[PDB]
Design a protein around this ligand. Structure first.
Ligand SMILES: Nc1ncnc2c1ncn2[C@@H]1O[C@H](CSCC[C@H](N)C(=O)O)[C@@H](O)[C@H]1O
Ligand SMILES: Nc1ncnc2c1ncn2[C@@H]1O[C@H](CSCC[C@H](N)C(=O)O)[C@@H](O)[C@H]1O
Lengths: 318, 318
């Protein structure tokens, strides 16, 4: 039934985490025809239990049965590459720390405090937890960097970044967006603000150990907030945009690169539940973004659609 | 994309648990048209966060939006009844204790020590854990009874239970199967063997405290194993069927009431992975059941299909 399939949906995700995390997936790269007996003795997993996992992976369409050989479906080929966005997302999103948080989602809905499901579980915010668990932070940061690679060409096609001399990436993490921006747009001062215990060093990009909740550094032509605002409540979102305005001089711009809530925007609705559970954030309509900006003393000057589910918002003062 | 949907599948399951566990589902009984603002007050969830959950429930097809009100779709109507098999399954299967176990599935595959992911999580077996958790046990036990209620009719149609004077249900739990069998088949000596802290009393039904891994009581015409064998390794299953043989005298029979593995059989493949994670069990082919029977000193006398994924298997000593 439809109800039975929705109830058991989680098993498909759990099996994919197993397929990637155990190291099974890497044996399926380049559409290789894999023998499960060889796979069992290579990866050191009991043949019977691996053969049973493979039957489930075949059933849900991850693997394809060729008779006496199994292959990774072309649609799911990214799982074979451990550095792929999808593989890295699987390794942090479906890891115990994030997976187990969903257990406390019902409690978080009833508590009527400020604490998300992830905070109830770990007694820490998501980013506070990442500071104490390097491997989880590495997989998160890397997946985000891989995410930036997918949209950078479109961004550079739809928006003129070359008109700005000094560009700061607020919560830019590894600084992947600006590293890739540098390859086309040359001769600019590029900085990235984020919470670093060890400050990363690249030459062509500067890095600042900062806190955008308290203060944002002044003297930049462009301030970028990519997938930052959706991590935060309305008051903290205003606090970041406020701190942006306080550091701004007229002629300077803020660019928001964000997922956009629309009526029946499937991918964004799916994402919105994760943002509640993991970050206590939310996906927002353009109308909501405008009010957050207006409250912070900023005005929307232009909106351009990257995707059917994401946009860039240019902000100024007045 | 197909890969992205498979990765995020778990969120659909988590949202359904939230819908039932928080008590929201009870407001949608009898195709009731629910105001989300009214629902948010009555259940004590923040309106904004409940509205976001309902948007996700609409997307995945659980809820149906009519103008300003929502109803539970006729396909997912079982969620509104807290004693529906689907509601009871949701309340044990997607509960923290079972949900969190799936995190340790990759570790359980690599360790190769015979420990299921559930045992690595809680430090004891599912059934050992049930004896220590009354709410999880109550929901599990009730869901098992609803399982017996749904198929008892088909059981009595395809099998002559009337021919047997003394009937024992090995691992019969609540005794729901024999209680329903009593209503149609009367004047028989009905007994149930399981692990009881306190022995259930229906006076007419005999409830025995025992261990089917140690010994099974003799002097019964029928020994029933319903959803027991699939909980166990091949060796523990042989031990159970050995203890049956040793208790039996010629003319007595063992009836296995069990899910059956067939090539491409979707539902059983799904269940097979849960049996690994929670019980360190498995779903088996008829040929696998025959080897276990042969190893135990027993023979298959008859096989009768309940439905597509379920069968009853008569065993005899030979
Ligand atoms: N108070 C704070 N000050 C600075 N950076 C912060 C912060 N809280 C969170 N961050 C950083 O904000 C980022 C949010 S994730 C998004 C990163 C990047 N814009 C991208 O497109 O992937 C993370 O790097 C996180 O560590
Ligand atoms: N060692 C053991 N000795 C006796 N009963 C056991 C056991 N290990 C597990 N069981 C019981 O085996 C049952 C398996 S679940 C199936 C319950 C019932 N036959 C039904 O289908 O509705 C549980 O009730 C559990 O308590």
């Amino acid at each position: 039934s439809m109800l039975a399939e929705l109830i058991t949906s989680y098993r498909k995700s759990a099996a994919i985490y197993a397929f990637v995390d155990t190291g099974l997936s890497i044996h399926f790269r380049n559409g290789a025809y894999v023998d499960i007996d060889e796979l069992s003795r290579q990866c050191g997993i009991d043949y019977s239990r691996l053969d049973r996992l493979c039957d489930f992976l075949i059933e849900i369409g991850i693997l394809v049965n060729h008779g006496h050989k199994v292959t990774l479906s072309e649609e799911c080929s990214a799982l074979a590459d451990p550095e792929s966005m999808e593989s890295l997302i699987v390794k942090w999103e479906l890891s115990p720390d994030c997976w187990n948080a969903w257990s406390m989602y019902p409690r978080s809905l009833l508590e009527n405090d400020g604490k998300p499901a992830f905070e109830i579980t770990h007694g820490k915010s998501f980013f506070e937890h990442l500071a104490s668990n390097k491997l989880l932070k590495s997989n998160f940061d890397s997946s985000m960097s891989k995410g930036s690679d997918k949209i950078i060409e479109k961004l550079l096609d739809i928006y003129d970044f070359g008109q700005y001399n000094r560009i700061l990436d607020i919560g830019g993490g590894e600084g992947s967006l600006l590293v890739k921006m540098s390859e086309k747009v040359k001769g600019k001062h590029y900085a990235v603000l984020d919470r670093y215990d060890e400050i990363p060093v690249l030459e062509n990009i500067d890095f600042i150990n900062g806190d955008f909740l308290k203060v944002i550094p002044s003297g930049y032509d462009l301030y970028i907030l990519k997938d930052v605002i959706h991590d935060w409540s309305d008051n903290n979102a205003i606090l970041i945009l406020e701190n942006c305005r306080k550091a701004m001089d007229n002629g300077s711009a803020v660019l928001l690169i964000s997922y956009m809530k629309k009526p029946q925007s499937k991918m964004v609705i799916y994402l919105d539940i994760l943002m509640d559970v993991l970050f206590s954030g939310k996906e927002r309509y353009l109308t909501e973004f405008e009010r957050l900006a207006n409250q912070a003393g900023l005005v929307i000057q232009d909106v351009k659609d990257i995707d059917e589910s994401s946009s860039i918002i240019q902000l100024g003062i007045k």
